[PDB]
Amino acid sequence: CCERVVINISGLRFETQLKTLAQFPETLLGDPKKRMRYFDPLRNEYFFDRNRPSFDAILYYYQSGGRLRRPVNVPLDIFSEEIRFYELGEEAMEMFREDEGY
Amino acid sequence: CCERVVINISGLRFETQLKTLAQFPETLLGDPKKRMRYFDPLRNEYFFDRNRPSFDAILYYYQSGGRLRRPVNVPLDIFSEEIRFYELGEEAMEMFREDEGY
Amino acid sequence: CCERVVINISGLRFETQLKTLAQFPETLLGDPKKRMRYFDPLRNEYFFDRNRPSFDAILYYYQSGGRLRRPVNVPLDIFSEEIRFYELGEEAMEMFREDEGY
Amino acid sequence: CCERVVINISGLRFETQLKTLAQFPETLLGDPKKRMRYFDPLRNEYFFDRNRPSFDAILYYYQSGGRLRRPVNVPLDIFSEEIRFYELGEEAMEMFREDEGY
Amino acid sequence: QFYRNLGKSGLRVSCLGLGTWVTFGGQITDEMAEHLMTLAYDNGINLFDTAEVYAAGKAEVVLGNIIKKKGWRRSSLVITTKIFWGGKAETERGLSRKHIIEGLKASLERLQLEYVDVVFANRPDPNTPMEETVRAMTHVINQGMAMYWGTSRWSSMEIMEAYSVARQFNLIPPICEQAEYHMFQREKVEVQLPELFHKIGVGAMTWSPLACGIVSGKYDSGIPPYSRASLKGYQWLKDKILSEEGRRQQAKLKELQAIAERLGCTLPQLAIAWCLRNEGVSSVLLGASNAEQLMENIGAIQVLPKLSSSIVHEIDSILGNKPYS
Amino acid sequence: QFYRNLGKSGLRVSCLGLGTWVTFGGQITDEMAEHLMTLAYDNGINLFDTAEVYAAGKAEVVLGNIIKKKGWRRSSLVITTKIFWGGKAETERGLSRKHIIEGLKASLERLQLEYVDVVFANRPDPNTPMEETVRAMTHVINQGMAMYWGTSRWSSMEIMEAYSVARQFNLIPPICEQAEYHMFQREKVEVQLPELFHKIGVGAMTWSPLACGIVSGKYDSGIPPYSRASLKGYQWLKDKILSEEGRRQQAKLKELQAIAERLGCTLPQLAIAWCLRNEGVSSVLLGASNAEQLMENIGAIQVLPKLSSSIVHEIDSILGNKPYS
Amino acid sequence: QFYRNLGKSGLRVSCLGLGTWVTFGGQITDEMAEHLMTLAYDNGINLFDTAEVYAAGKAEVVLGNIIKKKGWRRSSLVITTKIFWGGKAETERGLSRKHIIEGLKASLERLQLEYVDVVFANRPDPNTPMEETVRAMTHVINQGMAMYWGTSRWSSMEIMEAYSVARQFNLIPPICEQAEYHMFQREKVEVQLPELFHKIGVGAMTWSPLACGIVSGKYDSGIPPYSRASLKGYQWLKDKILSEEGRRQQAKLKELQAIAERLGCTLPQLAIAWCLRNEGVSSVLLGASNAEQLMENIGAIQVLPKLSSSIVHEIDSILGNKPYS
Amino acid sequence: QFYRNLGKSGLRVSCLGLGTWVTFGGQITDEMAEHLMTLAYDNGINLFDTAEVYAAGKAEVVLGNIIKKKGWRRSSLVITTKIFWGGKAETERGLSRKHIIEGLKASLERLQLEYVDVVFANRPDPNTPMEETVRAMTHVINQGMAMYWGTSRWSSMEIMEAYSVARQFNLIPPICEQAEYHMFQREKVEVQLPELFHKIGVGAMTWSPLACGIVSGKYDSGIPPYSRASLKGYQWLKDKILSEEGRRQQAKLKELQAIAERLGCTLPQLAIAWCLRNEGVSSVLLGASNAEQLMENIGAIQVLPKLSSSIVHEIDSILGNKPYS
Ligand SMILES: NC(=O)c1ccc[n+]([C@@H]2O[C@H](COP(=O)([O-])OP(=O)(O)OC[C@H]3O[C@@H](n4cnc5c(N)ncnc54)[C@H](OP(=O)(O)O)[C@@H]3O)[C@@H](O)[C@H]2O)c1
Ligand SMILES: NC(=O)c1ccc[n+]([C@@H]2O[C@H](COP(=O)([O-])OP(=O)(O)OC[C@H]3O[C@@H](n4cnc5c(N)ncnc54)[C@H](OP(=O)(O)O)[C@@H]3O)[C@@H](O)[C@H]2O)c1
Ligand SMILES: NC(=O)c1ccc[n+]([C@@H]2O[C@H](COP(=O)([O-])OP(=O)(O)OC[C@H]3O[C@@H](n4cnc5c(N)ncnc54)[C@H](OP(=O)(O)O)[C@@H]3O)[C@@H](O)[C@H]2O)c1
Ligand SMILES: NC(=O)c1ccc[n+]([C@@H]2O[C@H](COP(=O)([O-])OP(=O)(O)OC[C@H]3O[C@@H](n4cnc5c(N)ncnc54)[C@H](OP(=O)(O)O)[C@@H]3O)[C@@H](O)[C@H]2O)c1
Numbered sequence A, B, C, D: 001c002c003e004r005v006v007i008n009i010s011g012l013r014f015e016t017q018l019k020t021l022a023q024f025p026e027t028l029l030g031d032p033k034k035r036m037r038y039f040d041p042l043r044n045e046y047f048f049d050r051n052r053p054s055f056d057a058i059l060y061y062y063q064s065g066g067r068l069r070r071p072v073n074v075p076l077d078i079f080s081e082e083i084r085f086y087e088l089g090e091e092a093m094e095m096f097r098e099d100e101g102y
Numbered sequence E, F, G, H: 001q002f003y004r005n006l007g008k009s010g011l012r013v014s015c016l017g018l019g020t021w022v023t024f025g026g027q028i029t030d031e032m033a034e035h036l037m038t039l040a041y042d043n044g045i046n047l048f049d050t051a052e053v054y055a056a057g058k059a060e061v062v063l064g065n066i067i068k069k070k071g072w073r074r075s076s077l078v079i080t081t082k083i084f085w086g087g088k089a090e091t092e093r094g095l096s097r098k099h100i101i102e103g104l105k106a107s108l109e110r111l112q113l114e115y116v117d118v119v120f121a122n123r124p125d126p127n128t129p130m131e132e133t134v135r136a137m138t139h140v141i142n143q144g145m146a147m148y149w150g151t152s153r154w155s156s157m158e159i160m161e162a163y164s165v166a167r168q169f170n171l172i173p174p175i176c177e178q179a180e181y182h183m184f185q186r187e188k189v190e191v192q193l194p195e196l197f198h199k200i201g202v203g204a205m206t207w208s209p210l211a212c213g214i215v216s217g218k219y220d221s222g223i224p225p226y227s228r229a230s231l232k233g234y235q236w237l238k239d240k241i242l243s244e245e246g247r248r249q250q251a252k253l254k255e256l257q258a259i260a261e262r263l264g265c266t267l268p269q270l271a272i273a274w275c276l277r278n279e280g281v282s283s284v285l286l287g288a289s290n291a292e293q294l295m296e297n298i299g300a301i302q303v304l305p306k307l308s309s310s311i312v313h314e315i316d317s318i319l320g321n322k323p324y325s
Helices: A055-064 A076-083 A091-100 B055-064 B076-083 B091-100 C055-064 C076-083 C091-100 D055-064 D076-083 D091-100 E023-027 E030-041 E054-070 E097-110 E130-142 E156-168 E187-199 E235-242 E244-262 E267-273 E291-298 E309-319 F023-027 F030-041 F054-070 F097-110 F130-142 F156-168 F187-199 F235-242 F244-262 F267-273 F291-298 F309-319 G023-027 G030-041 G054-070 G097-110 G130-142 G156-168 G187-199 G235-242 G244-262 G267-273 G291-298 G309-319 H023-027 H030-041 H054-070 H097-110 H130-142 H156-168 H187-199 H235-242 H244-262 H267-273 H291-298 H309-319
Strands: A004-009 A012-017 A045-048 B004-009 B012-017 B045-048 C004-009 C012-017 C045-048 D004-009 D012-017 D045-048 E003-005 E012-014 E017-019 E047-049 E078-082 E116-121 E146-152 E176-178 E204-207 E281-286 F003-005 F012-014 F016-019 F047-049 F078-082 F116-121 F146-152 F176-178 F204-207 F281-286 G003-005 G012-014 G016-019 G047-049 G078-082 G116-121 G146-152 G176-178 G204-207 G281-286 H003-005 H012-014 H016-019 H047-049 H078-082 H116-121 H146-152 H176-178 H204-207 H281-286
Touching: A004 A055, A012 A055, A055 A076, A076 A091, B004 B055, B012 B055, B055 B076, B076 B091, C004 C055, C012 C055, C055 C076, C076 C091, D004 D055, D012 D055, D055 D076, D076 D091, E003 E281, E012 E281, E017 E030, E023 E030, E023 E054, E030 E054, E030 E291, E047 E204, E047 E281, E054 E078, E054 E097, E097 E116, E097 E130, E097 G146, E116 E130, E116 E176, E130 E146, E130 E156, E146 E156, E146 F097, E156 E187, E187 E204, E235 E244, E244 E267, E244 E309, E267 E291, F003 F281, F012 F016, F012 F281, F016 F030, F016 F291, F023 F030, F023 F054, F030 F054, F030 F291, F047 F204, F047 F281, F054 F078, F054 F097, F097 F116, F097 F130, F116 F130, F116 F176, F130 F146, F130 F156, F146 F156, F146 H097, F156 F187, F187 F204, F235 F244, F244 F267, F244 F309, F267 F291, G003 G281, G012 G016, G012 G281, G016 G030, G016 G291, G023 G030, G023 G054, G030 G054, G030 G291, G047 G204, G047 G281, G054 G078, G054 G097, G097 G116, G097 G130, G097 H146, G116 G130, G116 G176, G130 G146, G130 G156, G146 G156, G156 G187, G187 G204, G235 G244, G244 G267, G244 G309, G267 G291, H003 H281, H012 H016, H012 H281, H016 H030, H016 H291, H023 H030, H023 H054, H030 H054, H030 H291, H047 H204, H047 H281, H054 H078, H054 H097, H097 H116, H097 H130, H116 H130, H116 H176, H130 H146, H130 H156, H146 H156, H156 H187, H187 H204, H235 H244, H244 H267, H244 H309, H267 H291
Parallel strands: A004 A045, B004 B045, C004 C045, D004 D045, E017 E047, E017 E281, E047 E078, E078 E116, E116 E146, E146 E176, E176 E204, E204 E281, F016 F047, F016 F281, F047 F078, F078 F116, F116 F146, F146 F176, F176 F204, F204 F281, G016 G047, G016 G281, G047 G078, G078 G116, G116 G146, G146 G176, G176 G204, G204 G281, H016 H047, H016 H281, H047 H078, H078 H116, H116 H146, H146 H176, H176 H204, H204 H281
Antiparallel strands: A004 A012, B004 B012, C004 C012, D004 D012, E003 E012, F003 F012, G003 G012, H003 H012
């Protein structure tokens, strides 16, 4: 709820409440056992050495509640390998490709 | 005037003077009673767990004095639900749609 | 030279060496008497409550040595009112409009 | 291995693991003797007073393992002078121009 | 509940405090000063406010000898002090780093204490940066000379500036605010202070609930002998009562005699329980010159359940000075 | 190995600790208290836990006279204390900055020590910000009154809140956690605590391994004389044993008599080595009223190699209370 | 106004200060040193500058015995010291952490003080990082050995470097700057210093307003006996006066005799009120060897209303050395 | 330049230091220990390295009585200590916050010093976080027990980890590094340490330049009596000399006799000036058991201009162990 989780994507910091990420319990950011290995205890943050412009669409997936879409500057090969890492499911991947038309 | 207000939009920090936000007293960022519930006392900032690229056009609405326009990477369904949150009025919404053509 | 100057554009921080800004002594960022009124002594930085995406093209004007160009997401009315503030001259404004075609 | 290298590109932070940059030992960010002259010891970071949007494509070259591509807002004259600085080779430059079509 | 927090802080103070302004070290004797604190400490008051400017430092000496004589635990008391005026020299005034460290070290030798709890900046200093004040207040807390710090008579922009510097430099923000609040002074504690409390967590410790004795109603027949208006050097209080704005206030206090008669209370008990009627005011600093006045004013806690919403509406029609936000 | 780290910290404590609750300064004499610590310190125990609330502060006095007289190096001991209740005054309770600094300075004069190692917040304080607690705990560490600090009985959300304030303000995070862990209290140390240990590095120093003497099995024939349930002011323990939920637990302990007979051990030695069977629990605070009990409970270290996986599966079928994640 | 702030800081100093260089502990006796400070302190001067290098540390001893003998309040004085030279050993020079902490502690035992107000770095140290100097200056302020710190003879780039380390590491920036400023040395305080004052808030405390006695005009007929140029080890001042660049300066001082005759003043009073004519200079460190010189130089405050814009234009045509920005 | 900085720090140390390992408090008497330090301090050596593990703490006692007897200024000396081992207890080892604060406070009572210049972590601690070590080393510097801190035998990843914690938490980074460097141990100081010097500013204070006396050449005819290899408990040095890898080294030292004969020097003077031939090594810790050895080894500064580039090329062909980057 009130607790805010700082997620650091290669030096870019995103801060969101814990009850936003816990809306989707089977993803990598929703399951605390999965994201436990990315925690930086000296900085109190989750560090992902991953693609930087992909994560704003991954973050707004949790905030809007399931409305993800590809950013305009991120290609389809890069962004589809980010949905598989962040584990947004076999279900929200099919809604992604139909919007895409693939 | 001199006082600067730090507004944190999901980890992205925007700093502006207080006399910029107080130019428009009926919005969410202009009325101190409305934005009181978003204040983070420990960090001395206003935290909004909202859309990140929408707020640069919302911030430049206050700086330019009423000239808002949609960013090129933010769709019309996302950005119109941000003008309703930040409470920019029924008056600056109609000037937005005419530029838009809606 | 070695000294670095932190310029804060509405919460976005740009750090550059002092011998980069001092390459152009008649602009607002090159003349120390002009930029004296924007200095924040408690944070050791220059704070400009101005447009945010315009300044990356203004910063790379000093780094490249005179090669400025408009960013793709910043319109011509917004970006031309930033060249007049940062005082890049009557000479580098004419090289801007010819590239533009104005 | 777990050590993280913070790279500062004109005020924009780009934290990365050391075993990511050490994947390519002949570049400027892979050879510790080459990047030694850019280290800021008071801040524990590498400071480059260079172009800002070019480096996200340079950073994702090391993370993906050799897949670089030009960002959409960075022109071909600006971005090609960044590959020569970061010393990504005569070999990954030829793979860049063929994708480009040059 | 009689004990309440001071702001958002963990410091539990009583809802009535005792102040050493004028009466201690000045007006009344050392033996009566020993008797008033024993009467206050046995009624549950733990808040004892003094300053270095009071009686040229003699008010802290009287307070200091009572805690040693009575053998009170320092843990059970909340001793607060105020630091702005140290003496005649130019370096002995203000909120500079030199005077906050010297003036508090000088007050801790008159009080004979190892620490005070809340040190107050007694008024704002325009000739000092706010960084220097907040660093010097943080310094005397980390040295252990004080636990908390607060501000007295600082506008809410100066309190919000002080708070901002403490978050910038990882210093200690103030917890408290002393503001004048009685029936004839309502603008700061009802408008400005409430906003601060919900935002950053600063409470109010309001002083002079009877307006130096005016709202007690004793001055309706002129100036009685042996009251504060007849003391030496207090012509500003006699000019305040006898002026035409001060003669009008006594015409309102006779209208408040009827409301205090409808309750069981008196007019000093009404004027104190009116100050405690909100959750924003964290304490009230009394003033008492004898044992009948202090026993009367501690009886104002019983009047606080008697104030309904309707009596608060009735008093504000008599006062006619309710502030607008 | 008998010595193990406390959390991720460098503080090496023994796997069995001795507590001064009830016995020291209360139940047993000063001469038996001198004999139990010499028996514990000669068996390798360096962890000696006390509090200021125990015996109205008399338990720290007994511990304090034992370390002075024996002449035990302070370097070889790990002395821990707990600070929540100081006395009757309203300012003498809680985790405010006033009470953490005063209550630890008051405990260091009864213990006659220059510093304790770990100061514990004995319970959480809802009337205090977490910034004020973490700044006051950092203050007494930087003054040198304590080396480490921990929390007792805090929800893992309160521990994670106190951790995030220490990283925000560059303060010192807690290293430890005291939680009740025996065969009849498993929810916090097996579910909540393990998550904290791998994330931020907080270990558990579990207290009451025999549930105030219940799991020793002595209460199966009623209430024996001169045990803790028959002491004055401990009716809450007699109501716990004689109730129908407490009579059911004694029916489980007779089933544990057969498992303790299959090993060489007894039932107190089984109930302690069961608490040390995981890597998350960093220590166990014993309680002992005489020299036969303490010699028995230190014999539970050698029973810890005897516990296989199968006996752990066998006890949990008898207990029937294994928590689910 | 006679008292003015030191930079932007809250430290209120007088516009004339007294320095212990040469005269104290060296040239003049201890009894005359007691008489000059009583004459200065009774005229409102609170600024008394010394150093550890002066008279091999004997100048701080003389100053130290006067404050104890006169019984002056430490609160009313502003004592400043300089710490760059300690002795013959290699570890006794520089601005290292060893010498700042070690050096200041040695000066506080000769001055017999608990603290000085402003400790100055007497010259820059190329063999030390600026982090080590700013951390060591912050250390002696947080220990309470000093209130403020400043720098002497530092290039405005070195002052701006020391400022940017203090904001980086949350340390304490310097408040002051001692720079030589008389009629024949104008480049730093009129060009470099003003920029610093409006940017970061560093004031100037200028020393040698009479250029070691040259601008007093006493050296026009050669070298008078019992002046500073005839003292032992001051051949550098005799070589400065008698050289052809120094003989030209005396030809300008005869032209300044006519301007000092048009006013009521003398030439030392003119040369001091010329240094105070701007708002950037926060103080002027006098030097006086007897009571007639000090009474003369404190009479330069009266000449400061007499300087109009036109006399400032007239002197600068005689001097012919106005710097260009 | 006899005096050189220690890393980038402002601490000026001499190029030769005196160590108290084995000799002081062990091998040689207290009267010879007084004579060696007077011979060293009169030749300009200010660096005197000791540890708490040496002679079970008796080596610091001997050093402590010499500084009090000779009346040396503490300002002129650089005293360094090492804190890894304190005794037999489990809490008396490691780099925990408990042992760094206790072990340095225990060493300052044997040395009879107020403070020490550099405190050295004598070896790395795998059972302690680096945050706890850097916070405890920062703590004893801010309390004034030490000025600087360094590390001993820490790999360059552990030094770079300790540096990145100090910038993260605004702590104090180490300035120094003690690494073994002689003709038969070259890998750390020529490859790993030079990289760290130019990056973060850590210098090397190399110990054992003669490899516990091997490179002096005295062991070529077996084991001479009254040397270190024949002392009690030093069988590891006799096993090192008499082994087949240690017999091969003596065959190289006879080839170095010809190079030491071409210069005026001896083989101990050659083996020390070879260690000072680079700018990375900031000091060399000697060892001396009598006054002829120490007078011989201080004569190695004169041999340092005699080493050209060609003799450095000639020795490395004899040694045959030059590391590759
Ligand atoms: N700037 C600041 O922070 C500040 C400034 C002023 C005061 N304070 C604090 O507030 C306290 C003073 O409040 P105050 O004394 O000024 O106003 P009160 O309203 O606190 O004044 C009480 C005085 O008025 C008279 N009085 C009180 N109760 C009475 C009763 N029931 N019947 C008849 N007379 C009564 C008393 O006798 P007399 O009429 O004979 O005197 C008494 O001396 C001080 O102790 C001080 O610590 C703070
Ligand atoms: N909030 C907190 O942090 C907290 C709260 C409570 C305790 N603690 C710590 O934990 C310690 C107490 O643990 P505890 O004493 O409550 O439970 P135990 O389970 O530690 O209780 C031991 C007590 O039960 C009886 N007993 C122990 N071993 C026995 C044996 N082998 N045979 C027969 N009887 C035996 C003893 O004699 P009797 O039956 O005659 O008494 C003894 O007094 C204290 O020292 C305290 O420091 C911490
Ligand atoms: N690096 C630094 O920070 C630094 C360096 C130097 C000085 N200072 C400070 O500045 C102070 C010294 O200033 P200063 O003494 O060098 O130059 P002044 O210009 O301050 O020198 C005054 C000296 O010149 C002569 N003099 C002064 N007034 C006179 C008058 N009205 N008539 C005739 N002779 C007069 C005096 O007698 P005599 O001619 O007989 O001597 C006196 O000893 C020191 O106290 C020191 O604290 C600081
Ligand atoms: N971990 C650490 O940080 C660490 C570890 C060890 C030492 N250290 C420091 O380094 C110092 C020790 O260096 P070291 O003593 O081990 O190696 P050296 O190379 O410093 O050893 C000198 C010893 O070898 C012999 N020797 C020296 N010069 C000689 C000469 N000219 N001719 C003949 N023999 C000579 C001496 O007599 P003998 O042969 O009769 O003994 C002497 O006792 C200690 O004082 C200690 O403080 C630090």
